[model samples]
Target: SKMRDRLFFLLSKYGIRPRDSIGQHFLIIEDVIEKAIETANVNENDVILEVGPGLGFLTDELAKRAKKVYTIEIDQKIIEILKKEYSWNNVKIIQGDAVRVEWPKFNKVVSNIPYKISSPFTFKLLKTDFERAVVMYQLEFALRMVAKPGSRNYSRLSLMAQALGNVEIVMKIGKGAFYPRPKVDSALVLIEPRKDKIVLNENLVKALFQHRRKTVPRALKDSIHMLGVSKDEIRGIINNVPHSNKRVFQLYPEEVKDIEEYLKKHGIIS
Candidate 1:
């Protein structure tokens, strides 16, 4: 109750209104907040990257728990609140659009990442150098991320997430946990960097998945124009691709990466 009113008063005092574009539903649940911190396994050596540190409640806790914190804020008004009310040797407030900014060197990440930037931001973070991340996502999106190959929730997002890190859904939060109370539920997810670090050719993968039900060989044949190659190259690609007989939907992320690597090896697509 104190936190709900406290955030309410602060936003009113600062003339700050939540922006739906940034997914600014400020998290208000104390217990859920604690779980996010705990899941991150924050320690003295950890340098945390917190994106869109809206109300800075999570940032405040992270600063105390980790060695240092880099919090990115896009809204000028909310940054003003953080600027006026909070000060910590460990916390550095950065004002920028997180999707474009060059992130500083950090070993860990923690934030209720903005919903709109979820796909781009997450794919970006997975590419960065980080030990782990404990972040909140709209539950539906989280499901797609952790979805298996044969499941209906599976998509390119699922493969990309699996390709980069081991993702787990650690907690489920109801709408009431947020300040404005998000219309949808949220899930806290932990992304620990996995050992495999293969970068697949996204265009080829996207083109192939369009015919997800078709065999990989047939899919490639149909999507030849999208692959930026002539019929001559498709023959070579389909022949060399390891799982040409497998259905597009059945292929794993690594198999997709293998196809890209084969294309690169054969100079089909640079």
Candidate 2:
């Protein structure tokens, strides 16, 4: 109730209501923040990158623990308010689109990001050098990120996520956790980048999934234009891979890597 009161107070003070539903469900109720913080195991030496940083509660907690905290908020007035409200010298309030913004060096990411920015933002995070990220994402989206082959949740998101990092659902948050009460549940997710993980071309991830129900070889054959290679060129390698006969959705990252390796070797794409 106190936080709810404060949420209203802030809205009135700033003269703002949530401008959009893209991701404005601020964390107001108890949502196991300590669990999220404890799971990240934040330390004094850690440098944290927090996206969204709505209400600045997590920012305050992170600022206390980490050597430095960067909270990037898209809202213009909110950033100004946070700058004046918090006296934390360690926290740097930045204003930009976190999805497109070039970030400073940071080892860990700990934030509840906007739901609309989930896809592009996650794509950005996976490419950077980050040890771990503890984030709250839509439950269904979170499940799809950690899903494996032969599951209904298995999708392009699952494929790209596993290719770069190891993802796990840390905890689930009910709709009541948010101030406005979201229509769906949420999940706290953990993504740890792997040193030796195979990062595939983005286009390949899209092209392969374009014909997910088709056989791997057939999918490759049909989407030759998207792959930036000819059918004849891919046909040479399709027969070479053991899993080419399997459906696109059934192939594992390891099997997909075989295609990437051959494509890269043949100068089809870098």
Question: What are the lDDT figures for the candidates, one per model?
Answer: 0.83, 0.81
Question: What would the per-residue lDDT of candidate 2 be over residues 112-224, giving only the tens digit for each residue?
Answer: 87689888888888889999999989898898888888687677778878888989898898888777888899999999997779878777767788878888767766787
Please give the lDDT score for candidate 2.
0.81
TM-score for each candidate, following the candidate numbering: 0.90, 0.91
Tell me the deviation in Å of residue 266 in model 2.
4.3
Compared with the true structure, what per-residue lDDT tens digits does model 1 show for residues 144-165?
Answer: 8899887777777888788878
Best by lDDT: 1
Q: List the residue pairs that clash in candidate 2.
A: none
Decoy 1 TM-score against native: 0.90
What's the lDDT for residue 251 in model 2?
A: 69
Pairs clashing within candidate 1: none
Top model number, TM-score? 2
